[PDB]
């Protein structure tokens, strides 16, 4: 079984927006979005599709832009660094489960060198 996916709202949470929150949307992730590299992680990962049987008995917290972006959407985060929190997990994630040179590797490298210089300065 893949687990269920990561919640996208939560009526206990309170939401927010903030000019912050809002730029990591239109700018920050909708620009990962569309790099070359961002496919594999624009929804959670499939194990049963991807035969990674292993992948959810290592990865026990998961998070993809899918997710984010869906968070972004319903305002579900308090503040950006709740999100850039969760870009981090993503990216960390890949590393945890592959290994240094792997090709997925490589290309969360390069998305997350984007991610940093794009959140170096947010809107006020
Ligand atoms: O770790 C991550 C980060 C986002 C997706 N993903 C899982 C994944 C997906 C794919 Cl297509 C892989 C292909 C070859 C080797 N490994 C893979 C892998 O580990």
Redesign the pocket.
């Given at each position: 079984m893949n687990p269920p996916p990561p919640e996208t709202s939560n009526p206990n949470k309170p939401k927010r927006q903030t000019n912050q929150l809002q730029y990591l949307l239109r700018v920050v992730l909708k620009t990962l979005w569309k790099h070359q590299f961002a496919w594999?992680?624009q929804q959670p990962?499939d194990a049963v599709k991807?035969n990674?049987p292993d992948?959810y008995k290592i990865i026990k917290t998961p998070m993809?832009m899918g997710t984010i972006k869906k968070r972004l959407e319903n305002n579900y985060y308090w503040n950006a660094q709740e999100c850039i929190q969760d870009f981090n997990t993503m990216f960390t994630?890949?590393y945890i489960?592959?290994k240094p040179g792997?090709?997925?590797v490589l290309m969360?490298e390069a998305l997350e060198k984007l991610f940093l210089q794009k959140i170096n300065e947010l809107p006020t």
């Open positions: 594999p992680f990962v991807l990674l992948y993809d994630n890949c489960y592959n792997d090709d997925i969360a």
